[PDB]
């Protein structure tokens, strides 16, 4: 799924605790609202623990 | 040298050689990811271009 031409809102992503893994490789998630990117992609699949 | 904190000023030379942090997080003076050696060697061949 391709997501673009919208204001990125990661505020609800780190303000929840239902997730188990929030490791961000390459870039630091402490500064995300101040970063400007061109393309944002999101994959989805289900795997065992 | 391949890495320099900022742009160098005219008629200036620098001697210091230490691992150059090139990431959001520092590697704190040991060899690893997001830091490399600014000083790297030349390679030549007798039959090169």
């Amino acid at each position: 799924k391709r997501i673009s031409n919208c204001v990125a809102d990661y505020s609800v992503l780190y303000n929840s605790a239902s997730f188990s893994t929030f490791k961000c490789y390459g870039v630091s998630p402490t500064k995300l609202n101040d970063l400007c990117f061109t393309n944002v992609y999101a994959d989805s699949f289900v795997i065992r623990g | 040298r391949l890495f320099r904190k900022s742009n160098l000023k005219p008629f200036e030379r620098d001697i210091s050689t230490e691992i150059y942090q090139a990431g959001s997080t520092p590697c704190n003076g040991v060899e690893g990811f997001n830091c490399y050696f600014p000083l790297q060697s030349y390679g030549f061949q007798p039959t090169n271009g």
Partner: antibody, heavy 119, light 110 residues
């Protein structure tokens, strides 16, 4: 600069009720995570509870489950820690912990705390 | 039953680079971020390493952090070994809806 003031202890009570309050200033109280951390005198650190920015979700450890509670408000910028049915293990110093984006980034905030002993 | 195993009395050395190892057993510590904190005895604690590789502003450039996924351990090394106040250090990780603290590593003789 962020100032954290804690004054909720100073008396001994077996199995009673005690209310602790942490005062915070210098930052917005309704956009980060708060938590609470205690440690025994002469022993290691341990975790107590973590609080969302609106108080919708609260969690504690399994050793204190069933008891323990937390409440918050953004109008007065204060945290309320109520206790019930204390034991002898509860001799600890309590710091009101504050987060930045979530509970994976780190704590990085610890008040001076208040001595809390039971007898 | 996530727990972090680390020693209690290391780094008793003058002025060189020594390492402190923090490892877990129930799960992989490389899945979530692991941090390092320092506690002044009789005073408020502070944090030396956050985001598993970064230091806060004002922290000196000497304390190092690294992650080894082969041994499932996290390494904290200090380079300068200056006249810092005696303290103890702890390890933190995240399994599910909970926080886990380390045992503690005393460092008094520098």
């Amino acid at each position: 600069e962020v100032q954290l003031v804690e004054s909720g202890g100073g008396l001994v009570q077996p199995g009673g009720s005690l209310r602790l309050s942490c005062a915070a200033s210098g930052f917005t109280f309704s956009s980060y995570w708060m938590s609470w951390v205690r440690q025994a005198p002469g022993k290691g650190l341990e975790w107590v509870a973590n609080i969302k920015q609106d108080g919708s979700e609260k969690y504690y450890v399994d050793s204190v489950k069933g008891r323990f509670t937390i409440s918050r408000d953004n109008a007065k910028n204060s945290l309320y820690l109520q206790m019930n049915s204390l034991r002898a293990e509860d001799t600890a110093v309590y710091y009101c912990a504050r987060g930045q984006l979530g509970p994976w980034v780190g704590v990085d905030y610890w008040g001076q705390g208040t001595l809390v002993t039971v007898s | 039953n996530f727990m972090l195993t680390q020693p209690h009395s290391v780094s008793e050395s003058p002025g060189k680079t020594v390492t402190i190892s923090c490892t877990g057993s129930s799960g992989s510590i490389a899945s979530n971020y692991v941090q390092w904190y320092q506690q002044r005895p009789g005073s408020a604690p502070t944090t030396v390493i956050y985001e598993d590789n970064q230091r806060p502003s004002g922290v000196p450039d000497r304390f190092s952090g690294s992650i080894d996924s082969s041994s499932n351990s996290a390494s904290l090394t200090i380079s300068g070994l200056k006249t810092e106040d005696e303290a103890d250090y702890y390890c933190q990780s995240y399994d599910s809806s909970n926080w886990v603290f380390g045992g503690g590593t005393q460092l008094t003789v520098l």
